[PDB]
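Teaching assistant here, posting this on the class forum so everyone can see the example we discussed in section. The complex has four components, and the goal was to see what a joint structure prediction looks like when all of them are supplied at once.
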Amino acid sequence: QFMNLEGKVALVTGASRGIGKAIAELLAERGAKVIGTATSESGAQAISDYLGDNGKGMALNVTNPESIEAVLKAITDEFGGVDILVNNAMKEEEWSDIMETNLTSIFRLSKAVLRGMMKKRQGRIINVGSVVGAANYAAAKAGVIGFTKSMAREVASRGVTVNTVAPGFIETDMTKALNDEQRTATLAQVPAGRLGDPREIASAVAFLASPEAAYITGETLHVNGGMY
Amino acid sequence: SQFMNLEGKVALVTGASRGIGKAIAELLAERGAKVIGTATSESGAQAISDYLGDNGKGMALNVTNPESIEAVLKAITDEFGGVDILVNNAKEEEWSDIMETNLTSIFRLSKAVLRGMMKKRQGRIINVGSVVANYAAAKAGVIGFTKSMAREVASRGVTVNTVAPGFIETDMTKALNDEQRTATLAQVPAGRLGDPREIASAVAFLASPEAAYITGETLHVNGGMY
Amino acid sequence: QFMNLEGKVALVTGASRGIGKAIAELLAERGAKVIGTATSESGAQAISDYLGDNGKGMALNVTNPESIEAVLKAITDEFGGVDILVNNAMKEEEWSDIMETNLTSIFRLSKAVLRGMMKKRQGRIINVGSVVGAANYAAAKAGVIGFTKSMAREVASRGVTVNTVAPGFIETDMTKALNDEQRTATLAQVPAGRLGDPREIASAVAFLASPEAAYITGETLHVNGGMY
Amino acid sequence: SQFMNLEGKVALVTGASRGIGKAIAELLAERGAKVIGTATSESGAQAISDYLGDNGKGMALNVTNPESIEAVLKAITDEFGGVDILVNNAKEEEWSDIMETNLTSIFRLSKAVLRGMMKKRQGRIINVGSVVANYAAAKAGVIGFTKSMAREVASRGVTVNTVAPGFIETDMTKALNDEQRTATLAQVPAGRLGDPREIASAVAFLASPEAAYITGETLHVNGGMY
């Protein structure tokens, strides 16, 4: 009974590796039927292989409303309606790309799943913010929280919660590349004196996803070791 | 499973007699913790001991008195081991009493358990704020203090966090007049009162090994109130 | 001496009416040379007429980097470099329009003026957020603050401050349209029990613009009568 | 000009002897306010009276004592008129003293001036927080209290706000060792200490008729610290 996701259908974007993956795997351990996603059909297959009987991969282009419609219809058809949504992850271009990837795509896919969730008076939307390395990332991240809080207020009456998980410095593929010099400047900024693990983000997501977290909405949960 | 297991942890829950304090203690016991729940009197401590059974016991505790703190912690150290998880729960006369109950006592007891936690490089301090001016000042004080303490001790494996409840279903709420209830709901977007279990769920999460990288956080459980 | 803007060149976007106007007028009273802007040349003339000797209107398209370059060169040529910048003011389209008007345009024009400001070790950038009526507006507004805080940190060392003024419910052209029924629901939400005046936003902007406010940066100043 | 003029206002500034308290009192006097600056002793009150001259005077004040509060306010009411602007400026022994100086005293004196301000539908209460754990808890308490009080009294024309300074140039900072100064700057993005005038500028703004729609705000003057 305690924090069990048996009977839930979870849509995890960006499920191929790292945080996206660690989330998908944990939600699977907790009993959820996990549809993890990737921008390509190959990545979707890699997702399908690690999930096995606990779900599958699907190719998804969040910039395209038809690709969204078809994925949700497909999920509704095999699994039931998505109960849990987890949204994962200088020129004029870097800006407009970050705003699309880290903000607009988070808005669009959130609005899309809500129809079905509010029909059921039950849903969980969780937006995972970008892990720290800035203006562009800061602007998008604060935009998501902005949006999360307003959407939270509009839908709380209909049994849907909308929350954000804000990671600090997390041990990932990229972070190992930063040399022993650049390593220490990162740890200097964290009171814990260590990088966070992708499992720790997944733990925060799964809690918020649980029936136990039904009265938590419009919250930003920081997982940063005191780097605030 | 190893997921969110508190087996091997000793939890001190203040204000454990009823409602939120009780719901916390019970859940931490379900998760495998050895729970010492507290009350201001020896009778309340007995009531606590009866509901916990083999998963812990009740102790009398006066947080305004440093000696009563010292003796409770030595007693817990003696029967159970050092406290691993601390849950701090609880005109002029209005003010100075609120500042003592909802702030100073939270400071004092937090500082007291820290010695042992930093020796182990492992601890959890969780301050539960008051249910929704004197209360506002105390509550903001705790978060103030939680954040500064969090920074000082994160290096030594201790996390310090706050859980901030909204409007929660209690003894108190059965006296809410016909539309006085309606008046309170109007402020909560979720359209309902929160359950004490939901506060306990938030506490137990933050208490878990899984929440090691969460410190200096305020976790609001309010159905959208803010 | 006290809060005097004599010797400052202020660029106020959206200066045609209401808040934009009230800002431009006040900064003019305080001694600044005010270039107020509008999307058209006609609006720019209307601006020029109310400012008189204290500045002028210029047509500006913030979505176009060339229109930005040319306006700044023109200001540099007649007045000196901009010392103070004040940035003023559901389909897929409503979203992407709000993100452009209330966020991307605020980023772009901010980045553009910074070159000259950091050469002088002196500048003021102030972003006025949208007045309240939501997800789209909330997302953009929180994005601006997000961006304001990161940019503030990057440039504070070089004598530039970057701040936000966040208005509540403000008495404007639009707000009078809301009927005597819809009027009271607005006042219900404000502890003050009244709408704010556009002068009150302009007062907050001009303070932050002053030499006196040199140690204020990365701040969101709320002018909302307690509606927080 | 009528811009940010405090002519006709009576301002009470606690902690007016030196530094920030002084810089505040002086500026509010330049803006035309009748400034009563305070000190814990009668000698300090005299020093205050000497620098203010015709723009106000010094009074001795013990914020821990309700009678000392009552008598100072009656005295101000008697010579100047009711206070229009209040600027609240200022082991176990460490803690309970900080909570009294930086929090309870702020509460008490705020509540005291409110009576007269709400009768006039016009007032300004401004709490200056401590310069950068006990301090964190007090400071967060004041903002806590500021926000709850702000909500309760905004309808009656009184605004209540906080100014939160960062690292400011004082007596204290001349004792900062060669690179201990450098260590403190490292945390401030502006690369410099703030001037007491800059705190006074923020206070005087919020004190102005222009700032009538600002209430329940924390105004940080920190060069980007946060």
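For the discussion questions: Chains A and D do not touch (no CB pair under 8 Å). The first helix of chain A runs from residue 18 to 29. Think about how each of these relates to the inputs above.
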